[PDB]
Subunit: 114 residues, 2 copies
């Protein structure tokens, strides 16, 4: 008569990495985000969960969203984070800009790097 609990310390990382690979190939991706003229394919369940702006958007029909006021390479970073929990070796000047796009999109961790 006993209870067992187990935690998979590596789960989160492998999941996220599989999910990031999925979006690299468009696997299971149900939305396309267009920034400047670059198109990012992605998963609504992930963006909704992690972004208050996308949370708002995806409570209604929509397969395409067009964003302004944010550069493609900056948005690329927001996604990389959304799909890894990390920003990695970002250059110090792009930071202020990155922080702002996090603010616009409601990605708390990016918004609050300052």
């Amino acid at each position: 008569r006993k209870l067992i609990s187990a935690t998979d310390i590596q789960y989160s990382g492998s999941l996220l990495n599989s999910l990031n690979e999925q979006r690299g190939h468009g696997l299971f991706c149900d939305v396309t985000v267009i920034v400047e003229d670059r198109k990012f394919r992605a998963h609504k369940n992930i963006l909704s969960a992690s972004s208050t702006y996308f949370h708002q958007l995806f409570s209604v029909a929509g397969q395409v969203v067009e964003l302004s006021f944010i550069r493609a390479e900056i948005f690329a970073e927001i996604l990389n984070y959304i799909y890894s929990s990390k920003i990695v070796r970002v250059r110090s000047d792009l930071l202020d800009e990155l922080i702002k796009s996090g603010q616009l999109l409601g990605v708390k961790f990016i918004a609050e790097l300052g």
Copy 2:
């Protein structure tokens, strides 16, 4: 002239928890799994990433999958893990059974509790 990296230690947990809540309400869920006569709503991107059996299934059309040889309450646990990275206070006798369903579904961490 400098590079910045940041890691969000809490990201994985919040993401997973938001995702688990989503499936509790069927939000963004694109598959239904029927075990015994219980129906579980879920996300293909998550199950594909985490289960080799579902990975196989979801490379083709299909909105419903019917499983046999696995009890509902046992499958419920596999999902809870898939959506938390943890099994929590599982009773010791159900374990052997849980391990087997992990084997059938190809959920490495569950398969390898022995």
